[PDB]
Amino acid sequence: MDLIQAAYFVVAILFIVGLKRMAHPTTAKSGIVWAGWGMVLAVLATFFWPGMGNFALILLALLLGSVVAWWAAVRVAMTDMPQMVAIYNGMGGGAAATIAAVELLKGAFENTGLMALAILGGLIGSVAFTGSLIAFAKLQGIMKSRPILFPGQKAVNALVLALTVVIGLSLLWNDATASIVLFFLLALLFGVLMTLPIGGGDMPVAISFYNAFTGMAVGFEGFAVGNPALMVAGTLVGAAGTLLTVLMARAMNRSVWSVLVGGKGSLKPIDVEDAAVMLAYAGKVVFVPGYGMALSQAQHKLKELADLLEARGVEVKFAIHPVAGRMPGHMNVLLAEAGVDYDKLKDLEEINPEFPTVDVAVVIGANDVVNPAARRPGSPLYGMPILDVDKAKNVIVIKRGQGKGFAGVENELFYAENTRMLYGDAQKVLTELIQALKRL
Amino acid sequence: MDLIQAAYFVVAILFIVGLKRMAHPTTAKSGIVWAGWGMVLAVLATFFWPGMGNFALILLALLLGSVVAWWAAVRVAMTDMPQMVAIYNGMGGGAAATIAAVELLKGAFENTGLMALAILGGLIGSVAFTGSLIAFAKLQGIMKSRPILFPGQKAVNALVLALTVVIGLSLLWNDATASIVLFFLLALLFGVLMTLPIGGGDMPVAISFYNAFTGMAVGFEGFAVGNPALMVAGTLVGAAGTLLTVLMARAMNRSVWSVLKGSLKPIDVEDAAVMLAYAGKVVFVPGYGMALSQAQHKLKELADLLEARGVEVKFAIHPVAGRMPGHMNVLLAEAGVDYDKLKDLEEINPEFPTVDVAVVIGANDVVNPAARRPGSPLYGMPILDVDKAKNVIVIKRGQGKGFAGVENELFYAENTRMLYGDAQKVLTELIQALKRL
Amino acid sequence: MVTVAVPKERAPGERRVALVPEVVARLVKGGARVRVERGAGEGAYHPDEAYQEAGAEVVERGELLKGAHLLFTVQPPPEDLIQALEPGAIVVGFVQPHKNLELVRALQAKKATVIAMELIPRITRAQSMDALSSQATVAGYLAAIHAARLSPRFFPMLTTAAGTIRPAKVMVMGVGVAGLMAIATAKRLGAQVFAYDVRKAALEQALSLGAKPIELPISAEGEGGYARELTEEEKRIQHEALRDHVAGMDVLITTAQVPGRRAPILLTEDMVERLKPGTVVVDLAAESGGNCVLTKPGEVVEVRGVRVYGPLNLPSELSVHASEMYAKNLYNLSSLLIEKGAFAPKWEDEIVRAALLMKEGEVLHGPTKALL
Amino acid sequence: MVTVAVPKERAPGERRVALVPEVVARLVKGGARVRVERGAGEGAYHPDEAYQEAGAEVVERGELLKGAHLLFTVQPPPEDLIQALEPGAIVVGFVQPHKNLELVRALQAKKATVIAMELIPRITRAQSMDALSSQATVAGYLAAIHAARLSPRFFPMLTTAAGTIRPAKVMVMGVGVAGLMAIATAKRLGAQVFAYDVRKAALEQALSLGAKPIELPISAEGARELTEEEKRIQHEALRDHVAGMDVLITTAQVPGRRAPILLTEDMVERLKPGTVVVDLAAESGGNCVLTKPGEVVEVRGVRVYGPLNLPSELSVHASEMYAKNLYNLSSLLIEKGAFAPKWEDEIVRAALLMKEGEVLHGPTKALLG
Amino acid sequence: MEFGFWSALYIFVLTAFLGYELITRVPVILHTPLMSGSNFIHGVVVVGAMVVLGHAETGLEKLIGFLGVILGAANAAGGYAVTVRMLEMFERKP
Amino acid sequence: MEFGFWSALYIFVLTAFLGYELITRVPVILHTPLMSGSNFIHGVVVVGAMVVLGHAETGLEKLIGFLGVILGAANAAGGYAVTVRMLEMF
Ligand SMILES: NC(=O)c1ccc[n+]([C@@H]2O[C@H](COP(=O)([O-])OP(=O)(O)OC[C@H]3O[C@@H](n4cnc5c(N)ncnc54)[C@H](OP(=O)(O)O)[C@@H]3O)[C@@H](O)[C@H]2O)c1
Ligand SMILES: NC(=O)c1ccc[n+]([C@@H]2O[C@H](COP(=O)([O-])OP(=O)(O)OC[C@H]3O[C@@H](n4cnc5c(N)ncnc54)[C@H](OP(=O)(O)O)[C@@H]3O)[C@@H](O)[C@H]2O)c1
Ligand SMILES: NC(=O)c1ccc[n+]([C@@H]2O[C@H](COP(=O)([O-])OP(=O)(O)OC[C@H]3O[C@@H](n4cnc5c(N)ncnc54)[C@H](O)[C@@H]3O)[C@@H](O)[C@H]2O)c1
Numbered sequence A: 001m002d003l004i005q006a007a008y009f010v011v012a013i014l015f016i017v018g019l020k021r022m023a024h025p026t027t028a029k030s031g032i033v034w035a036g037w038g039m040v041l042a043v044l045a046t047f048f049w050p051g052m053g054n055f056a057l058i059l060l061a062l063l064l065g066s067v068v069a070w071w072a073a074v075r076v077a078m079t080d081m082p083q084m085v086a087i088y089n090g091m092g093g094g095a096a097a098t099i100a101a102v103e104l105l106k107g108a109f110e111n112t113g114l115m116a117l118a119i120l121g122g123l124i125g126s127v128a129f130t131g132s133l134i135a136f137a138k139l140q141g142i143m144k145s146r147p148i149l150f151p152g153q154k155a156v157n158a159l160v161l162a163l164t165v166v167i168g169l170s171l172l173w174n175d176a177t178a179s180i181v182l183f184f185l186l187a188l189l190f191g192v193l194m195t196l197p198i199g200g201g202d203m204p205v206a207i208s209f210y211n212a213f214t215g216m217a218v219g220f221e222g223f224a225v226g227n228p229a230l231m232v233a234g235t236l237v238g239a240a241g242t243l244l245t246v247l248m249a250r251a252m253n254r255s256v257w258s259v260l261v262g263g264k265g266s267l268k269p270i271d272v273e274d275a276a277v278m279l280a281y282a283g284k285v286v287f288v289p290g291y292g293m294a295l296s297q298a299q300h301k302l303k304e305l306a307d308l309l310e311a312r313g314v315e316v317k318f319a320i321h322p323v324a325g326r327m328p329g330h331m332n333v334l335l336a337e338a339g340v341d342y343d344k345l346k347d348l349e350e351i352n353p354e355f356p357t358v359d360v361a362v363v364i365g366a367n368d369v370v371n372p373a374a375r376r377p378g379s380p381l382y383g384m385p386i387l388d389v390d391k392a393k394n395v396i397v398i399k400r401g402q403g404k405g406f407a408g409v410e411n412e413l414f415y416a417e418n419t420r421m422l423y424g425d426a427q428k429v430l431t432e433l434i435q436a437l438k439r440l
Numbered sequence B: 001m002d003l004i005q006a007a008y009f010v011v012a013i014l015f016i017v018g019l020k021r022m023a024h025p026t027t028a029k030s031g032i033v034w035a036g037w038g039m040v041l042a043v044l045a046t047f048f049w050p051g052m053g054n055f056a057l058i059l060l061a062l063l064l065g066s067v068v069a070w071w072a073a074v075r076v077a078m079t080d081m082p083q084m085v086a087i088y089n090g091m092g093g094g095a096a097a098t099i100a101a102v103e104l105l106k107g108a109f110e111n112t113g114l115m116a117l118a119i120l121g122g123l124i125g126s127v128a129f130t131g132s133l134i135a136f137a138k139l140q141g142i143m144k145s146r147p148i149l150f151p152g153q154k155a156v157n158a159l160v161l162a163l164t165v166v167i168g169l170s171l172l173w174n175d176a177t178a179s180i181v182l183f184f185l186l187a188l189l190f191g192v193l194m195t196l197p198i199g200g201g202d203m204p205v206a207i208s209f210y211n212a213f214t215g216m217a218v219g220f221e222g223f224a225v226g227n228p229a230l231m232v233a234g235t236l237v238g239a240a241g242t243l244l245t246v247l248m249a250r251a252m253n254r255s256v257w258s259v260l261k262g263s264l265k266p267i268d269v270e271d272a273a274v275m276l277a278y279a280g281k282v283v284f285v286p287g288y289g290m291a292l293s294q295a296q297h298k299l300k301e302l303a304d305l306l307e308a309r310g311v312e313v314k315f316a317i318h319p320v321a322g323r324m325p326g327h328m329n330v331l332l333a334e335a336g337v338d339y340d341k342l343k344d345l346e347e348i349n350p351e352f353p354t355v356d357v358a359v360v361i362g363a364n365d366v367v368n369p370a371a372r373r374p375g376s377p378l379y380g381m382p383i384l385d386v387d388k389a390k391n392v393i394v395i396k397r398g399q400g401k402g403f404a405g406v407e408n409e410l411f412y413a414e415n416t417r418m419l420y421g422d423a424q425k426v427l428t429e430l431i432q433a434l435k436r437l
Numbered sequence C: 001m002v003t004v005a006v007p008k009e010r011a012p013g014e015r016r017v018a019l020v021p022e023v024v025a026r027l028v029k030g031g032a033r034v035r036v037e038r039g040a041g042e043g044a045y046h047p048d049e050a051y052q053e054a055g056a057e058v059v060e061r062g063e064l065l066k067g068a069h070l071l072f073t074v075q076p077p078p079e080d081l082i083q084a085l086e087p088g089a090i091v092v093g094f095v096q097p098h099k100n101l102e103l104v105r106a107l108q109a110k111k112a113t114v115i116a117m118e119l120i121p122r123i124t125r126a127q128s129m130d131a132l133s134s135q136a137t138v139a140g141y142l143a144a145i146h147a148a149r150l151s152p153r154f155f156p157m158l159t160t161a162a163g164t165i166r167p168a169k170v171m172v173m174g175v176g177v178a179g180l181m182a183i184a185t186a187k188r189l190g191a192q193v194f195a196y197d198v199r200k201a202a203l204e205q206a207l208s209l210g211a212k213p214i215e216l217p218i219s220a221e222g223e224g225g226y227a228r229e230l231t232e233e234e235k236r237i238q239h240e241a242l243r244d245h246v247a248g249m250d251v252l253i254t255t256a257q258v259p260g261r262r263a264p265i266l267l268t269e270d271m272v273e274r275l276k277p278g279t280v281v282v283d284l285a286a287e288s289g290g291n292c293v294l295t296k297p298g299e300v301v302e303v304r305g306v307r308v309y310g311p312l313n314l315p316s317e318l319s320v321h322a323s324e325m326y327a328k329n330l331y332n333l334s335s336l337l338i339e340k341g342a343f344a345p346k347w348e349d350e351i352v353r354a355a356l357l358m359k360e361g362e363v364l365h366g367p368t369k370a371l372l
Numbered sequence D: 001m002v003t004v005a006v007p008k009e010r011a012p013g014e015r016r017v018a019l020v021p022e023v024v025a026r027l028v029k030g031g032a033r034v035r036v037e038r039g040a041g042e043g044a045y046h047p048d049e050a051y052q053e054a055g056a057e058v059v060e061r062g063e064l065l066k067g068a069h070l071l072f073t074v075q076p077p078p079e080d081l082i083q084a085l086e087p088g089a090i091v092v093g094f095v096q097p098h099k100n101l102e103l104v105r106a107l108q109a110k111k112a113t114v115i116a117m118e119l120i121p122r123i124t125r126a127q128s129m130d131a132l133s134s135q136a137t138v139a140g141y142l143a144a145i146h147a148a149r150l151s152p153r154f155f156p157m158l159t160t161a162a163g164t165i166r167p168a169k170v171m172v173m174g175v176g177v178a179g180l181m182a183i184a185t186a187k188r189l190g191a192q193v194f195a196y197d198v199r200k201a202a203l204e205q206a207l208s209l210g211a212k213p214i215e216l217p218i219s220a221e222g223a224r225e226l227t228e229e230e231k232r233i234q235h236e237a238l239r240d241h242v243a244g245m246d247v248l249i250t251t252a253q254v255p256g257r258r259a260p261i262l263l264t265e266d267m268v269e270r271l272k273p274g275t276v277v278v279d280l281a282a283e284s285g286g287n288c289v290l291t292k293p294g295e296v297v298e299v300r301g302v303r304v305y306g307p308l309n310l311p312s313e314l315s316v317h318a319s320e321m322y323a324k325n326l327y328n329l330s331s332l333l334i335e336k337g338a339f340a341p342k343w344e345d346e347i348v349r350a351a352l353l354m355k356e357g358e359v360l361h362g363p364t365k366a367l368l369g
Numbered sequence E: 001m002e003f004g005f006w007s008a009l010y011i012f013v014l015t016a017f018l019g020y021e022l023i024t025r026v027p028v029i030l031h032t033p034l035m036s037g038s039n040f041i042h043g044v045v046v047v048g049a050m051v052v053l054g055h056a057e058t059g060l061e062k063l064i065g066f067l068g069v070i071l072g073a074a075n076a077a078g079g080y081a082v083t084v085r086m087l088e089m090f091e092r093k094p
Numbered sequence F: 001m002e003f004g005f006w007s008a009l010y011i012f013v014l015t016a017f018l019g020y021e022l023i024t025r026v027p028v029i030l031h032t033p034l035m036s037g038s039n040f041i042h043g044v045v046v047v048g049a050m051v052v053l054g055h056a057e058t059g060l061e062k063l064i065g066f067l068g069v070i071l072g073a074a075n076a077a078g079g080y081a082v083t084v085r086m087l088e089m090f
């Protein structure tokens, strides 16, 4: 099988390459095509796996399997996508569980390790199958999205699984074909049970967790029989999936353990890199400087970033609030210093009807001047001319902690659905922002 | 089914994780904590290799290799570090060529491809060993040289190689003791003849080149002896050294192939100290001159006195400033400069037009504006933008040049001024004059 | 349908006008009649015909105030204006009771509604009306311009093939609206600048531009907002270290003022004597006293070589922009007196109630009630 | 063992001292004796005791020229020192015969060697001696300061609670050494600046500092291709440009000639009220027609200032540079500390105005007839 | 961990760290399509089920292996299609 | 020890792509001490020189193995001490 293994070696590389290129901003599109050719060759090589039988049966399960999926995906809407991954993920766990049972019914191995990895791969597969279909059912509205509890379920899940394990281990000494499907349905059952307490909003992270679970399974199952391609791609997705799980929990401002059970708005912390993300790809950006920029002496790291944007062709404009800072024209002098051209410097009256077409709004050390409390007569901020920074499609704010402005009020702009927060010293962050944008 | 193998698996993970943790700066410190155990673990595990004899002789050569190098490593000055990589890189290369040598005298390969991986590793081993000994000879100084560049050498060097290859390929059907020696000799010949057209500068691009080579050698020999640690680590070192050579070749003004108007306006030490004290943003640009004189200790003392007054001080670090990779790094380490004052080119370049004074010490080509245009020789250079600063001070003895072979047009610009004298004889005069203001 | 007036100011050396043709143009666009005296904007280089094009009315003094509901003055209106007052009319503008004590007591015999512009509170509402900020801005600017005009020294660190000239060392003594303004322009030119004050918040405002703040062995302020009351063991070291730091200075720009008292002295005779010749003493506090002992109002003097200058009206010298900045201060304040071009005063307002000097021969301002 | 003498400058309204005490010290340690008159640097704020702390002898005016070999003047020596001189003695300093013809004829009647400081080569070798360089920068910096001083407008752009202030649009006409520092200081202030010159090389030096150049197109090097078509290329183009201006600083000059009329009458009528014209070329005519020499005039609404002797105003630094110009010039006249002039160096050979009385400079010698 | 024991145990850990480092330092706006990309990649289950189906003996092995080939074919063909449509929002509409 | 062809070629490829991507995100500040480590790591070349020396019989085979261990342990303990002090400079 030199031609198949050499193919499964060519297949091995293409996946990693695909995986690499699908992670990066610019190569994202092309990454999936690299992985697309690998599947064609691998399947074309296993048509030549020695001792292949039932060909008219192989071709049809390829036919009705390749279209049933391709159909279901191209026609549906753009917001029903979280659940579609889960179910395709589910069936992949089922597909691994199916490879597991066959060589278990054969008695094809008397090897005590291979069996143990065939079984352990079959367990997690059936769990990753029925788990992703319950996960599938919650976002669709066919099933209750909110967490589903019943009295004392932490001892029902853990003893359903504890048997699913002890019964899985029994297949080593006693692989009677009557304790195998009970092991399989126990995992198809624990598949349902453990995806019951997860919230409808908590479902994405669960799908990535089952995406790892399917990946892991096809690794161990790929090891259980002499199959290099499965060995390569399995743990390659598995190890990717668990990291994928934690980072997706890191973003939702939570942890993986909270979602596994969990039984006008709010502030939103963003890392220095994800801001450079929205900034590498925008078109209309407006910097809103405040007194914080001054205390940090940031002006030089700001103008440095603006030039990095002008080069990428990005339209950069500066919005100086009348009272921005502590003295009149406080910013104008500190921006005349860095060397900012005066045509890039516009006031409120000619820039406010321009904000609804502004993508990202980067506020730096400003607070009272950007505060949407100034519109209302009831606030100590009224009378002051207002900067329409909240109409911008996205907003990113820069400041160390909770420190207030002059007058001494909280800013409800920070809480906005289109506003995100960046913490730390001003020029210390812009430096990290410039460093991340050149990296992309 | 064995416990000598189990060591090697934990051995390789420690190499990889170490490597991973060594790659990044915050955890690099715990990095050598991880590979050192992978080396302590591996040596101990091979004492239990079934049926080992000569046990008195192995342990002696171990202590003779270990204690001799352990000593040489700690008692050598920090600036003389580039060649220490090369000589150990040699030792290992020699030790790799040896594994090929003994297992060809026995006639102990029941496979054609295994010999082809055993011999090829020795090819790399002998070359990477002997070349790093000539590199050693050209950085140290007891018979230092620039490129010798003899006429039509590229034809006779490519002749030797092809002749070693024909002798090497002759081992497959004829594993004669005579066919073993000449092969090694020619590999040790080519390995030298090859490090002849190499500059006493370009050596950084050659040591890692030999470092990756030693990695490949170790890789292939591991595959040849069925040794998983030398299998994994070998290619885990080679490929790292491979990218390493390129990243430190393209960080150079060069690629991986070239190796193989105004007026001067003088200034007094007292006039230069006046520029420093009132100067808000100062940047030191160091080079080979700081090294030759050993001015490093008189440079940080000026960086701290400016900082005690308030002056925002940063160090522009050209990856190629000096006669080795990170020559500035380890000297600005030996003195005790904070690495956060140490900035490479790309993070400090757009900071210059606002740098009040850009003090340059014993540097020329790294800050030469000729590297911009396709006419002059310095092209391909990641250029250091010192010319756009508002005031520039240059430290050098008189009318000397660098390496590539060009006069600097930075010296003549309306903004730049020169400071004549021995490097640390200048800086001490800068400190003590600034102390008087 | 309201009418509002704007006069030609009488105080010696004043070159300003309360309303400019531009702001006047948008107020008749607002819906009002504007009455203007013959040649009021001539100090700010806005000709007589510049206002007529806006939609106002150019007339002679006396005929100006018959009918009006709003008067917009720079400095407090004099006798012949105070008498021309109608009841239910509001007097908007600077008063400064302590210096214009006469023009004050004149307004009571006719029972007129006066609002002093110096008593605008400092929250956010009337920052677009904060005249204190706008005019001290203009002054602090020229304060530095004159400092380089009169300085025998390069403000910039001048480097040439000839030699190294160090930048002139400037000290801003008193850091406020004019102070910060003076500090900034001094660094524009290249001078290494110092900033003296007592408020730890003002010392932070200073370093934001790029200045080293003057902290003596005795920081005069701490926690809450209150400055220190030095006894006999401390106002001397405040003075001595304040005499040694000032000694090595080329320009001392001084801006320390109080709203009801004559300027407190920062530069004493002995601090003056320890000054080197060639030193420039700038004193904006001359309009109400002067920070330096040797300052005489409106005249340039020299003794032991030290040049001391004391200007009363800086906004007059930069009359074009100062008036323009002053007119919009009134315009955003017209958002509290004019309603769709109709006379709708707002007695309920916190800017008005916290700036209203009188209510028809009725001094609300306790301090203005205090001085009489 | 050589002796240097420093006289008090007595021309109408000057405070520049030839040698500051800090330079005399380099000469006293440089081997020389320096004689200084009683009260010379009291214009540049250098007291008597400052000079005697360096190593000099404070003496009377009649006592000033007893044995002294070199005479360092700022402006050409009055005739009371032309007579107290010594033989072979060589005078150094501005002589400029267009204001001092009769004092120039007084030095040639006496037979004294003289060097004029408006004759130093304008190549980069002799930039460390160049007086008018160090005395055109001191004026140009002040050209911008007086522009802002007299200006009723703001130079920088400022966004305040009271509207958006636009920067003062400044033009610096004739950009030499006085033109270069009149831009940068106006740039320091935050003004939008423009710079006009007949030369291509002074349009690139101006663009270098940041300003956008005015729209060409002549040569004239180096009022020669300027008068081809007789200045109807100069008067035609920038009449529409000056219409946007807030400030006009003019330094344009031709060595020994009348100052070319840059600002006429129909050009200053399009000028806005509050506009400022600073004319440094007031000492040999006027770039503008309305420049009354030494007086702050104002017509229609445009203030016209013609500043005579601007280095005088910035005495401490103008003298500090000028003395260094003289100290670095003293390396061709003083060997270790003994009178040793160089008659054979190209800098002395193109500047030696008179040797032994005979006027060596070209036209110099012309008019005196 | 077989073919032979140690060789693939290396492979396993060498794939565990390689997949890890490949996913370290990934942006936030690309969190779901890469998850859709990995979902496709582990759809390899087909190749192994094709063999398992090509080696079906006891008839009961003929149906559950027939299921797995479809189950896998759905994970693959369905993985690719979900990843392509997620990448077209990252492109401008021509 | 028994290591197959396809099992080894995967390892080969896996540790190759592993190291590659570890080294991708290196700061300029690390290049030299980072070089000193890889120099140390391949000092595992003692193990092989030790294995082959414990298998020598003739008079000329026993020598070059003794040579290979001195070079190896010198590459081993030499690479460690040059990097310990290079990493100490932190
Ligand atoms: N300009 C005038 O003439 C004038 C006159 C009167 C009143 N005012 C007042 O001035 C105020 C101007 O408002 P504004 O929005 O421009 O400023 P602001 O409301 O005072 O907000 C300043 C913010 O900057 C942040 N900051 C400070 N140092 C920082 C650093 N190193 N890095 C990052 N962030 C930093 C602070 O938060 P952290 O502490 O959490 O970092 C602080 O909340 C107005 O409220 C007005 O009432 C101005
Ligand atoms: N580091 C690397 O990675 C590397 C490796 C290979 C090649 N290179 C090449 O080397 C060049 C690097 O340029 P560089 O600026 O770092 O160094 P450089 O251009 O070689 O400059 C060396 C200068 O230092 C001065 N100097 C020597 N001793 C001195 C002392 N005691 N006091 C004062 N000055 C002294 C000399 O000038 P005076 O004689 O006038 O004093 C000499 O011109 C590049 O062109 C590059 O191609 C770099
Ligand atoms: N921001 C504010 O709250 C505020 C308050 C008042 C005035 N201002 C404005 O600031 C501008 C300038 O004023 P300033 O604040 O710079 O002046 P300033 O900060 O210099 O203060 C006045 C001076 O009085 C002295 N002083 C006061 N009490 C003393 C005591 N008990 N013992 C010894 N010395 C004492 C201090 O040395 C101080 O320098 C003015 O235009 C004014 O409108 C602002």
Ligand SMILES: NC(=O)c1ccc[n+]([C@@H]2O[C@H](COP(=O)([O-])OP(=O)(O)OC[C@H]3O[C@@H](n4cnc5c(N)ncnc54)[C@H](O)[C@@H]3O)[C@@H](O)[C@H]2O)c1
Residues within 6 Å of the ligand: D122, D123, D124, D127, D132, D133, D136, D173, D174, D175, D176, D177, D178, D179, D196, D197, D198, D199, D202, D223, D226, D251, D252, D253, D254, D260, D262
């Ligand atoms: N290293 C250097 O680059 C350097 C330094 C200093 C001086 N220089 C040289 O010294 C020379 C003397 O300069 P200066 O300061 O005595 O000149 P200046 O002070 O008399 O100013 C006159 C300037 O106006 C320009 N001008 C002449 N005729 C004009 C006209 N009709 N309209 C408009 N502009 C006109 C000239 O180009 C000149 O630059 C320059 O030519 C220059 O080349 C060179």
